[PDB]
Amino acid sequence: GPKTQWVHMREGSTTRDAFFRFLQVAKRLSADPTAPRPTLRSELVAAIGRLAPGRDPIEYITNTADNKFLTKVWQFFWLEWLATPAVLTPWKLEAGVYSAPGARTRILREDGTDFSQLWEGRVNSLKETIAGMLNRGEISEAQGWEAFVGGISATGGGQDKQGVRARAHSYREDIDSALAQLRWIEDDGLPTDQGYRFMTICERYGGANSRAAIDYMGATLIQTGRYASFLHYINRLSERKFAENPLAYTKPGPGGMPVFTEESYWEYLQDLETKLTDELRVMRKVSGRARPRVRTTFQVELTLLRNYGFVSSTRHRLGVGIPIDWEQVVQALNVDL
Amino acid sequence: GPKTQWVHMREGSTTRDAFFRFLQVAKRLSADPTAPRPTLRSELVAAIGRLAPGRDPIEYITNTADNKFLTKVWQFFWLEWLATPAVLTPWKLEAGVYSAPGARTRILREDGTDFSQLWEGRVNSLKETIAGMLNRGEISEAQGWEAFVGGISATGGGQDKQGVRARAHSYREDIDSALAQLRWIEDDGLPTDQGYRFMTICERYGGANSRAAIDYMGATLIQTGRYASFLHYINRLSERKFAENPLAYTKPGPGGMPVFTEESYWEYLQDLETKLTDELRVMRKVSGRARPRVRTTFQVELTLLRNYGFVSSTRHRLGVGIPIDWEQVVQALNVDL
Amino acid sequence: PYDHNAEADFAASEVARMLVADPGLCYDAASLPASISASASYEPSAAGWPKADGLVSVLEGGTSTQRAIALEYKRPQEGIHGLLTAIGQAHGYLHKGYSGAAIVIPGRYSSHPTPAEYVRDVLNAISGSRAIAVFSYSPPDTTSPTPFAGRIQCVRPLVFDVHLRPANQGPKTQWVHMREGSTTRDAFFRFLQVAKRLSADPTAPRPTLRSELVAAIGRLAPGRDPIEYITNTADNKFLTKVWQFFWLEWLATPAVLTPWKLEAGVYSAPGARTRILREDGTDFSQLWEGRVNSLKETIAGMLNRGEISEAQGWEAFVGGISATGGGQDKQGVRARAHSYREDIDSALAQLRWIEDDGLPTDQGYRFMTICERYGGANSRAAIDYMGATLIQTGRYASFLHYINRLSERKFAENPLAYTKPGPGGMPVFTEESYWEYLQDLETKLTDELRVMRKVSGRARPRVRTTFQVELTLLRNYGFVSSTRHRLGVGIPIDWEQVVQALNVDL
Amino acid sequence: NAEADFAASEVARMLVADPGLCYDAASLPASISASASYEPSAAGWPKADGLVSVLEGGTSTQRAIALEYKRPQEGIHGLLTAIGQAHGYLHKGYSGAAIVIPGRYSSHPTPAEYVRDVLNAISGSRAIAVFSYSPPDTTSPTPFAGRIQCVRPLVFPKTQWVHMREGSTTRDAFFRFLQVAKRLSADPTAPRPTLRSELVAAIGRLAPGRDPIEYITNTADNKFLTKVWQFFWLEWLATPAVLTPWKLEAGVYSAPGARTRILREDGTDFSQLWEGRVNSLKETIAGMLNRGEISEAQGWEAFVGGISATGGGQDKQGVRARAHSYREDIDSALAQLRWIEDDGLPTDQGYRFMTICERYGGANSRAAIDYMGATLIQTGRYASFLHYINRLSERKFAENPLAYTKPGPGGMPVFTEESYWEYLQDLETKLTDELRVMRKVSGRARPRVRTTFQVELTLLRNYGFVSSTRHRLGVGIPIDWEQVVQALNVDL
DNA sequence: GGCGCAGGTGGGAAG
DNA sequence: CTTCCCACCTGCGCC
DNA sequence: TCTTCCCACCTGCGCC
DNA sequence: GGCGCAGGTGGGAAGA
DNA sequence: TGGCGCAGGTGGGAAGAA
DNA sequence: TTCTTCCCACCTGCGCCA
DNA sequence: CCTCGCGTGGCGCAGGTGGGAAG
DNA sequence: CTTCCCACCTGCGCCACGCGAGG
Ligand SMILES: [Ca+2]
Ligand SMILES: [Ca+2]
């Protein structure tokens, strides 16, 4: 079971602003080691006591066990930037009916449109389902508060729902791994010199969505995140298939002019993933879930490279496969972080 | 464990040119191992035959043995730059009396006034003595050629003369030790990167007597050779002695004012030598051969530190002892040798 | 704050935002970058005579071509004559070694309503410099966090064109300015900690004072901010806010800011120390009390004798007490705060521990990490780092080289140069010889070498011996022997430690 | 009140005494009349406190210089205001302006020098002058007489990458040229080489009164670069063995077939000049000699000077003509790579190349190959050429991934050689006519033409930056980007 | 007995 | 007449 | 057996 | 006329 | 047994095509 | 006018270790 | 209403002084 | 009783901006 040889980053969790705010919290709490605690609301602690008696509400709603420096930073990041008191409101009882509060977190969306939503982005979400159950009379306010932090089990086959604890666990274990793999925090949790450099860039040039922050993050992904190694693997395994046959996946739809289709694209991506995970033993893959939909082969790496300009937006060509932009990759390799 | 803790140099043997040309010969021979052996004179091969019945005519005039890359470059350097065919002529008058040819080698001297010279220049020299006993009929021309390679016996007060073979051995050991201790050649004899840097600056900036070559030699003497450790030792001991008494070793002068005379300088240097030898166990000392003259305490070391600029030309002062110049030492201590 | 220095920062921020929005304002059409990031900053304190109101720093897609646009803000108060002065200082900043220079003039003047057009016509016909940008602004609304938002337009763009070293305006001391008691190690540690805590999550609400302090400030300074008066600050920069949060939290704490005590009806001194440790480490430092002639003791004595009442005592605690001819005027909280801030911030900037805008650099963060990990600014690791920084970043190594060269040159010509007869014929190196030698060294460094700066003498009984702070620091850190002088050498430098601290790669 | 009037009068009296500062040396009038006056209230927005009116010898001449006086009371801040006031005076319609400032300030020792430096390095205008004055003596009726001194007067197509040749810019050529330059810099008193008696006789016959060595090397100079070129030419390429035109064995003249001392790039053998093919300068001469059309003296003359075209062909060239072509394409290549300075001395990178070649096997060794490839990519700006062709190819193949393809056997598209040639021609047209980053001239209407991007693609293929297969259906030219990435961080 | 590395000695320059 | 330096000399231990 | 294609060896062309 | 760099052609090699 | 380090799903916008 | 199809911001939960 | 003339805010950085402590 | 050091105290130069007198 080889480990993936590049940085583990997600699409909505390990964004450019989440890293900035986590590092800022760590830096601020380094100078204030005796920070007392974050705070909750009485209904939340009552629900937590009903669910798990004799457990700390702060460490239960943040899904943490010890009280180390990194655990403290996560506790102060979850309950202050993502699970803000506005977000932790589960419903809005107006005129005898309940509805989603419509509260947003304090983290930017990584595109400048608005702030990121949590648990109530769209229909069928946690807050919407809880409000619907309350309106239908199936559950009471106490049961709604318990479900807001414990989650609703699947009614049919479907998929379960995630409470605050489970989402906190996922966000924490996918952001701390990304920060440790980029060498932006130490083993103890203190920021490193590169973390402070990112802090200074973001605080000087106008946040994590500025051009300087984007350039620094892209260079860090290419060099420290080992995305250049992934690009080299893809390019070397791709030119080895279009040199033996420049018409590998033509799918001759039109009568005389073959065109590279999306089915051919997925076949080529599957071949690349199989070569990377079996012949080269570089990637790590797990058995899938029997579900109506599946995530694509390289869903996050490809979109990260596309957004930062290292891969063309058309993501399609008959002879090249995945069109890489080597002028920007070379430029991003001389940043000397 | 008596072992000197700095590079072993000598006044007239381990000079800058004797290293530059040695490394140049090594570089040239490394790129063409199949090169013709140097050619001697005719009777010079005969005289060795008289001296030894089976010794090779080149392995005997150079004191070399076996075969190696270091031996080959040493032989080439000795027969091409120091024991040149012009130098190897003992007598070159043959008119009415055999005089000294006054042959000078191709190795420049440190002061740059003229080229170096062996076995000639003073009354008590090898060639002049041979010419003297050959004009007076004390020896024969064949006997003179034999003595030019064997060396006259004492025939005097205490000491003997040295021919070409023993002088070659002494020069070889001096140069080899001063180059191996400086880490300028590898164990196998191939030059390292520092040797190539020295060759480059010497060939580029006008020989080993240029300012750049002098600066590089001083830097590699201070850093690579442990001359800085020697300077630190003598400075620390001088300050330790003079803190108790800032007028130590002084003697009454004309008006009663204390003066640092030469005798005070010699006893101060002797105390330093005793501390470095029998107390710190840094130096190595041997018997003095019981001769009318004696070399001074720190002869080669102080000469090098004086002419390279790390010690003032005025060899002593009142309250400091040896006036070390620390600006130049510090400046030369930060140099990528 | 100052009615001029407050608007300069807002104008700089607005100009930076405008440059970010339209990259073609400062670039050319042919070489137009995809997008740029611009911030506002200020000129370093020790950089040249011509001082601009601020500079916009621009960073394009190359992530390395950082530029600077020295601004020149103008106000309608200085009539119409300020246009020519603005042009002159714009050319001055261009000579200073700046890529651009942006005039920020108002768009409306009493004489004529076209100031920007006239400025462009003068620049484009005679000046012939394409690096001078011209902006015309509308009367701002000084009631919002962004007063200049949307009221500035770029009338004339600029095209970009270093080595600002010389600054030939007289001698300037070449080593870092340090003081014995004010500018210390723990003060540096706590100032950096406050700066780092305020950079992350800025806009902390405010510090607060006592009711009596506010009343006294209003009485002796009507219509002024009590915090800005008691901190001697007249700006809204990041470093100004850091100083405000550092003065009233670590040094001028509420316990320290208590002037007197009313025990048994007789005024006394509270005996309260600050929260900053001393370099000795024995006890915390003290302020305005601890000696007979201190300010708190003098105020308590005046109160006990009935010369002044509580109101006058409160006024004197912050405004100081004048001297009736004999003696020096006593210093209050405001002037002492000015002195403390200008000794600490100058030393921090010269040591390159805080950036020009105010944020700490990598070396400042390293110092904070060392202090927090190893147990404070008095730990051995912090001492070693501070000494190495003083040797390298501060030009104390250059000072040692200068004094060593001068001393060697003096003593090589003649040993026993300054000695005097002792018990017999043996000369001794007494203190008078030491002071004469130090005075000669200072004269050589000042008049001839042009390395130091000397101003005047206060004409007071004490004399402020020649190398007071510098030799004290060198002796304490180990680069000079504890025995202050020696007959043979003079100042006994320990070069082993100097070369040990000259290469630590901080 | 009235203080600048005296300064204006002094400057007016000085201007006539020294016409050099008022007028340029090209058209300095013999006699100039100068007066002082005050500007009218309608002159302009700047007050223009005083102006000196100067007139040349002619009647129609008329100029006015408005002068600015800054007293020391203003301080060093008045220097900047004075600069701005001068610009306004020029804009108002005056011929010139004068900044009259004190010679020294309390804090500023050199005000006039600073103002002059500002006016030169930035303003770039010569219509404003600077006058620094010594402190005046108020007692005298003319305090500024002699105090004012002048400081500053007033005045009233390219390939875009390294040029390389397939057979003339080899690694050994660069190595030995640099070695000869270094050895000649070490010993400037080296003796000039020697030429054969027949060679010098033929040179004298061909051109009377010409230096035999300066002729056979195609140089007219005595500089260092010319000297090192002469030494390299007559020591490594035009060796005495190579300079033998024929062999007279058995009464029949045959080409000696002697090669030079410069190794070929492939390393199979040494290079050759004027021999090796059916037709060559050292073989057509032998054939003519065996036929008897020319004499041995005529043979030497032809060898030195070449052989005419004789109709319908390229006129064969001799040693003198080939010398210029060989010289001016190894000199230019080294200059563009900046391996030698303008004077002709090896740089740090040239010395690094020499050191690599000497330390390791030679010019045809892995280290030397890597260094030369990295130098070509980075210093030779072949990376710019690669980026240009890659951008154009991608922008052409994104619209249609079968742009130049032709129908195959069963209709499957195939990238044939004609498609490759027309694609290269389109790339050349884009790089020449549109991007304007290639100088190119047409001509030489001949039976054979030469491949577009011949030397560039040959070198790129040899060094590995492009694939051995010279074309592909999708990409076009198959650039190997891993090798370029590796070569772009060599840090020579 | 060969190597790595210590020890003398004449002639100019200065006192 | 005496002393010191620095190019030229000369062996000393020990595996 | 004839066609191109690349490399190493070979040729001049606009321009003060 | 000299100098910057452009433009050819034999002849293996590799096949139609 | 649970916490730890990652991996593997869905839901609406935009598009393209019938 | 309506059915697919891909993509990000927003959701789940294996799988091994103590 | 323009131009300097003079005042001063503020800023940066350089110059005193009391008490322990040795002699 | 005198002098030195170190933690405390103290303010001098000078630029840039602003208000006003004279023209
Ligand atoms: Ca201003
Ligand atoms: Ca005036």
Q: Which of residues 223-262 of B touch C (CB under 8 A)?
A: 232, 235-236, 239, 242-243, 246-247, 256-258, 260
DSSP 8-state secondary structure symbol assigned to residue C284? B
Chain A residues with CB under 8 Å of C36 CB are 211
Q: Where are the beta strands (DSSP E) in chain B?
A: 251-252, 258-259
- Best CA proximity match to B177, nearest among B40, B300, B315: B300
C37 to A212: CB separation less than 8 angstroms, yes or no: yes
Pairing of strands D63-69, D96-102: parallel
Distance CA C199, CA C352 (A): 17
d(C-alpha D115, C-alpha C95), whole Å: 10
CA D115, D116, D122, D125 torsion-angle sign = positive
Among D345, D363, D356, residue whose Cα is nearest residue D180: D345
Closest-CA distance, D362 to chain B, in angstroms, reads 9
Binding region of C: 4, 53, 72-73
Strand F atom within 7 Å of B120 CB: yes
- CB of D182 within 8 Å of a chain B CB? The answer is yes
Distance CA C17, CA C105 (A): 17
The answer to whether the Cβ–Cβ distance between B327 and C404 falls below 8 Å is yes
Token pair recorded at residue C493? 């430098």
Which of chain J's bases lie under 7 Å from a protein CB? 5-16
The answer to whether D380 touches D336, Cβ cutoff 8 Å, is: yes
Residues of C in contact with A204 (CB under 8 A): 39, 357, 359
Distance (Å, rounded) from C-alpha C48 to C-alpha D10? 34
Asked if residue D407 lies in contact with residue D413, where contact means CB atoms within 8 angstroms, the answer is yes
Residues of chain C with C-beta less than 8 angstroms from the C-beta of A31: 193, 196-197, 368, 372
DSSP string covering B131-156: HHHHHTTSS-HHHHHHHHHH-----S
Q: Which amino acid is at A264?
A: S
| Degrees to nearest 5, angle at CA C311 with C307 and C314 | 95
C-alpha distance from residue D209 to each of B131, C136, D426 (Å):
57, 76, 52
As beta bridge partners, residue D51 has: D37, D66
Burial class (CB in 10 A: 0-12, 13-18, 19+), A153: exposed
Cβ under 8 Å to D: A residues 134-173: none
Please tell me the distance from the alpha carbon of residue A270 to that of residue A304, in angstroms, as a whole number. 19
- What type of residue is D424? L
C200 close to B (CB below 8 A): no
Name the one residue in this structure whose structure tokens are 């030119």. Answer: A239
Phi/psi of residue A136, nearest 5 degrees = -70, -15
Q: Known binding site for Ca(2+): residues of D?
A: 49, 68-69
Q: Do chains A and B touch (3 or more CB pairs under 8 A)?
A: no
Q: Using the structure, give the distance in angstroms from the CA atom of A285 to the C1' atom of J6, rounded to a whole number.
A: 23
DSSP-H helix ranges across D106-151: 111-118
Q: Which residues contact B295 (CB under 8 A, 6 or more apart)?
A: none
Pairwise CA distance, residues D118 & B332, whole Å: 40
In chain C, which residue's Cα lies nearest the Cα of A210?
A: C37
Minimal-distance CA residue of chain D relative to A244: D472
Query: For residues D228 and A248, what is the distance between their CA atoms, to the nearest angstrom?
Result: 57
Judged by DSSP in three states, B219 sits in helix
Are the beta carbons of A297 and A273 closer than 8 angstroms? yes
Give the whole-angstrom CA distance, residue A190 versus residue A27: 7
Residue C36's closest CA among C59, C17, C57, C56?
C59
Q: Entry resolution in angstroms?
A: 3.2
Q: Measure in Å the smallest separation between the Cα of C157 and chain B Cα atoms.
A: 47
The DSSP code for D129 is E
Would you give the end-to-end CA distance of chain C in angstroms? 38
C2 Cβ neighbours under 8 A, 6+ residues apart: C234, C235
Residues of C forming the annotated binding site for Ca(2+)?
4, 53, 72-73
Q: Which residue among A242, A246, A327 places its CB closest to the CB of D387?
A: A327
Residue B55, CB, strand E, below 7 Å: no
Say yes or no for a CB contact (<8 Å) between A243 and D394.
no
The Cβ-side half-sphere exposure at C66, using a 13 Å CA radius, reads 11
Rounded CA separation C482/A188 (Å): 41
Residues in chain C, overall count: 506
Q: How far apart are CA C94 and CA A251, in angstroms?
A: 63
Residue type, D257: G
**Alpha carbon distance B230, B233 (integer Å):** 5
What are the residue ranges spanned by the domains of chain B? 16-207, 227-333
Q: Report DSSP letters for D169-203, one per residue.
A: S-HHHHHHHHHHHHHHHH-TTPPP----HHHHHHH
- Residue C353 is encoded by which pair of tokens? 């521990």
Contact C347, C178 (CB under 8 A): yes
* Angle at alpha carbon of residue C464, lines to C459 and C468, rounded to 5°: 165
Q: What span, in angstroms and rounded, lies between the C-alpha atoms of B25 and B28?
A: 5
Structure-block tokens of residue D480: 């190997």
Please report, rounded to whole angstroms, the spatial distance between the CA atom of protein residue D486 and the C1' atom of nucleotide L6: 61
- CA dist A84 and A67 (Å) reads 21
Query: CB-based contact (8 Å) between B318 and chain C?
Result: yes
- The secondary structure of D435-473 as a DSSP string is S-----------S----TTHHHHHHHHHHTSB-SS--BT
Give the whole-angstrom CA distance, residue D361 versus residue D386.
30
Q: Which residues touch strand J (CB under 7 A)?
A: A 1, 10-13, 109-111, 116-122, 125-126, 154, 159-162, 166-167, 169-170, 173-174, 262-263, 266, 286-287, 289, 296, 299, 302-303, 306-307, 315
Ligand of minimum distance to the alpha carbon of D86: 2
Looking only at the bridges linking them, the beta strands covering A104-108 and C132-137 are unpaired
Nearest-10 Cα torsion for C279, C280, C281, C284: -70
Q: What is the 3-state secondary structure (H, E, C) of C331-380?
A: CCHHHHHHHHHHHHHHHHHHCCCECCCCCECHHHHHHHHHHHHHCCCCCH
D366 touches strand H (CB under 7 A): no
Q: Are C45 and C349 in contact (CB under 8 A)?
A: yes
Considering only CA atoms, which of B106, B118, B114, B113 is closest in space to residue B17?
Answer: B106
Distance CA A44, CA A83 (A): 12
Which pair of tokens denotes residue C41? 């900053």
D351 neighbors D359 (Cβ within 8 angstroms): no
Pairing between β-strand D96-102 and β-strand D128-133 as defined by DSSP bridges = parallel
Which of the ligands is closest to the CA of residue C88?
1
D329 touches strand H (CB under 7 A): yes
Q: Residue B118 corresponds to which tokens in the numbers above?
A: 């062996």
Q: Which residues of A touch C20 (CB under 8 A)?
A: 206
Contact B257 C425 (CB under 8 A): yes
Give the count of beta carbons closer than 10 Å to the beta carbon of residue A136: 8
Chain A: closest CA distance from residue D209 (Å):
58
Contact B337, B224 (CB under 8 A): yes
Single-letter amino acid, residue A296: T
Q: For an interface test with A, give the residue of C365, C368, C506 to mutate (most A CBs within 10 A).
A: C365
| CB count in 10 Å sphere of residue D309 | 10
Q: Are strands B251-252 and A115-117 parallel, antiparallel or unpaired?
A: unpaired
Domain locations in chain C as residue ranges:
5-156, 185-390, 395-501
Answer left, alpha or beta for residue B284, where phi above 0 means left and psi between -120 and 50 means alpha. beta
Q: Which two tokens stand for residue C500?
A: 């040990």
> Is the CB of residue A286 inside 7 Å of nucleic acid strand I?
yes
Torsion of CA B144, B148, B154, B159, to 10 degrees: 150
**What is the distance between the alpha carbons of residues D197 and D329, in angstroms, rounded to a whole number?**
30
How far apart, in Å, are the Cα atoms of D146 and each of D113, D128, D136? 19, 21, 10
> Which residue in A171, A167, A163, A166 sits closest to A44, CA to CA?
A163
Q: What are phi and psi of A324, to 5 degrees?
A: -90, 145
Q: How far apart are CA C451 and CA C399, in angstroms?
A: 9
- Alpha-carbon span A98 to C337, nearest angstrom: 57
Contact D488, D399 (CB under 8 A): no
- Alpha helices in B57-158, H assignment, sequence order: 69-77, 126-135, 141-150
Contact C41, C357 (CB under 8 A): yes
Q: Does the CB of C483 fall within 7 Å of any strand K atom? A: no
What the block records as the tokens of D34 is 């100068």
Parallel, antiparallel or unpaired: strands A104-108 and D96-102: unpaired
Nearest CA among A179, A195, A181, A279 for reference residue A27: A195
CA–CA dist C436, C453 (Å, integer):
19
Of the candidates A185, A167, A178, which has an alpha carbon nearest to the alpha carbon of residue A63?
Answer: A167
Q: How far apart are CA C96 and CA C94, in angstroms?
A: 5
Ligand positioned closest to the Cα atom of D46: 2
| Distance in Å, residue C347 CA to nucleotide K12 C1' | 11
Q: DSSP characters for A64-111?
A: --S--HHHHHHHHHIIIIIS-TTTT-----BTTB------EEEEE-SS
Do D118 and D87 meet the contact criterion of CB atoms below 8 Å apart? no
- The answer to whether A174 CB sits below 7 Å from nucleic acid chain I is yes
Task: For residue C88, list chain D residues with Cβ-Cβ distance below 8 A.
Answer: 79-85
For tokens 């906190």, name the residue: A168
Tell me the C-alpha distance between D200 and D218, whole Å.
14
Q: List the determination method.
A: cryo-EM
> What CA–CA distance (Å, rounded) separates D65 from D79?
19
**D477 vs A: CB within 8 A:** no
Residue D390's H or E segment, with its range, is helix D382-399
Residue A183 per-residue DSSP state: T
Query: How close is the Cα of D49 to the center of ligand 2, in Å?
Result: 6
Q: Which residue is nearest to nucleotide L13 (CA to C1')?
A: C455
Cβ-based neighbours of B315, under 8 Å, separated by 6 or more: B265, B302, B306, B322
Q: Within an 8 Å CB–CB cutoff, is residue C506 touching chain A? A: no
Alpha-carbon span B196 to B218, nearest angstrom:
16
Helix (H, G, I), strand (E, B) or coil at B294: coil
Neighbours of C329 (CB within 10 A): 11
Amino acid at B61: I
Angle at B147 between CA B146 and CA B150, to 5 degrees: 90
A119/A128 Cα distance (integer angstroms)? 9
- Positions of chain I reached by protein Cβ under 7 A: 2-13
Ligand nearest to the CA of D8: 2
Helix (H, G, I), strand (E, B) or coil at A223: helix
CA distance A118 to A82: 8
| Separation of CA C107 and ligand 1 centre (Å) | 15
Q: Which tokens belong to D154?
A: 């007033």
Q: From CA C38, how far away is CA C66, in angstroms rounded?
A: 9
Q: Which helix (DSSP H) or strand (DSSP E) does residue A57 occupy? A: helix A57-61
Distance CA C200, CA A23 (A): 9
CB of B161 lies under 7 Å from some atom of strand F: yes
Chain A partners within 8 Å of C63 (Cβ): 212, 215-216, 219, 335
